[PDB]
Amino acid sequence: RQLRENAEDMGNGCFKIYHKCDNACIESIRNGTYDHDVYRDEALNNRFQ
Amino acid sequence: RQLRENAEDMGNGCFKIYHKCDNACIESIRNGTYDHDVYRDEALNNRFQ
Ligand SMILES: *[C@@H]1O[C@H](CO)[C@@H](O)[C@H](O)[C@H]1NC(C)=O
Ligand SMILES: *[C@@H]1O[C@H](CO)[C@@H](O)[C@H](O)[C@H]1NC(C)=O
Numbered sequence: 001r002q003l004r005e006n007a008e009d010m011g012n013g014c015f016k017i018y019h020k021c022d023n024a025c026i027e028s029i030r031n032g033t034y035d036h037d038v039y040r041d042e043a044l045n046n047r048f049q
Numbered sequence: 050r051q052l053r054e055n056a057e058d059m060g061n062g063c064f065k066i067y068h069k070c071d072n073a074c075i076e077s078i079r080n081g082t083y084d085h086d087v088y089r090d091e092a093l094n095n096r097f098q
Binding site for chain 2: 008011012
């Protein structure tokens with residue numbers, strides 16, 4: 001629900017984020033603060049292209 | 050998790066695969082061997098087009 005569209009569930013119990021994500025980028029997701037819109041445009045591209 | 054993007058959950062308890070899938074294609078999914086990348090490009094097209 002948090003990651004939203006930015007990533008996909010590989011199935012192996014991991015989410016294959018579709019965009020460059022630095023350590024800070026990761027940390028922002030673990031607390032729950034992370035926002036999808038930020039990387040939305042970026043991720044969306046690597047997915048369907 | 051297996052089908053990944055290739056298909057969609059119709060809701061009626063079925064997955065509407067978006068690409069030509071022969072009997073072998075199906076069998077590969079039942080054991081779990083099946084790979085998404087193979088039909089990724091193909092399926093992706095029929096979905097958003
Ligand atoms: C979540 O991570 C961000 C990093 O951008 C940090 O500023 C914040 O303190 C963290 N929040 C929690 C609950 O740890
Ligand atoms: C899965 O299906 C493939 C068909 O390509 C077949 O080669 C393989 O033996 C099957 N594996 C299992 C576990 O039945």
